[PDB]
Amino acid sequence: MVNPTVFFDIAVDGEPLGRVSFELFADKVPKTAENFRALSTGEKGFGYKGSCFHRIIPGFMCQGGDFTRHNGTGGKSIYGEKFEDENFILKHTGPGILSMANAGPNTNGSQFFICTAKTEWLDGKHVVFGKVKEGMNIVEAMERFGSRNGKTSKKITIADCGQLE
Numbered sequence: 257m258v259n260p261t262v263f264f265d266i267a268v269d270g271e272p273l274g275r276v277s278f279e280l281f282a283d284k285v286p287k288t289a290e291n292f293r294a295l296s297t298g299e300k301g302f303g304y305k306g307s308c309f310h311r312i313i314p315g316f317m318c319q320g321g322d323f324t325r326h327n328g329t330g331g332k333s334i335y336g337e338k339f340e341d342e343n344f345i346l347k348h349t350g351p352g353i354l355s356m357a358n359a360g361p362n363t364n365g366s367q368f369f370i371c372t373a374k375t376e377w378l379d380g381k382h383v384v385f386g387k388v389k390e391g392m393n394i395v396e397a398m399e400r401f402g403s404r405n406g407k408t409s410k411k412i413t414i415a416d417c418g419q420l421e
């Protein structure tokens with residue numbers, strides 16, 4: 257009944273930075289929310305722990321969740337390699353929105369991005385499924401390590417993750 261909360265503990269070249277928590281909108285996109293939750297706890301035997309934010313563009317987004325190829329070309333969901341666009345109820349309204357990365361229609365896996373700006377042009381193309389709850393300051397600190405082409409100046413990892421409550 258209550259939307260679940262998940263956390264990432266972020267590190268910068270192995271050094272602790274801080275914690276980002278997220279509300280996942282299971283009320284509106286239950287299948288997509290449950291994939292991110294499960295990958296956060298690692299309860300299926302695979303997931304986000306130890307992975308990196310491989311593409312950070314200041315004034316755009318922070319993208320991560322490729323735990324199979326580590327560079328934007330991999331990932332897999334708890335449902336199989338790919339799963340369908342669940343719905344497009346929610347929009348890309350501004351910083352802190354959590355949304356699925358993809359490579360065409362119905363190609364969701366494990367990759368996701370945290371917006372750091374409104375990204376309206378993505379509405380009806382990428383599934384929105386959550387938002388940052390606490391630690392937007394930490395997301396802003398992450399964003400300082402990115403670049404225009406998305407290469408990070410230090411390695412940004414999820415040192416730990418899981419579910420709160």
Ligand SMILES: Nc1ccncc1N
Pocket residue numbers: 328329330331357358359363364365366367
């Ligand atoms: N397989 C993928 C490739 C690029 N972006 C997202 C996904 N899911």
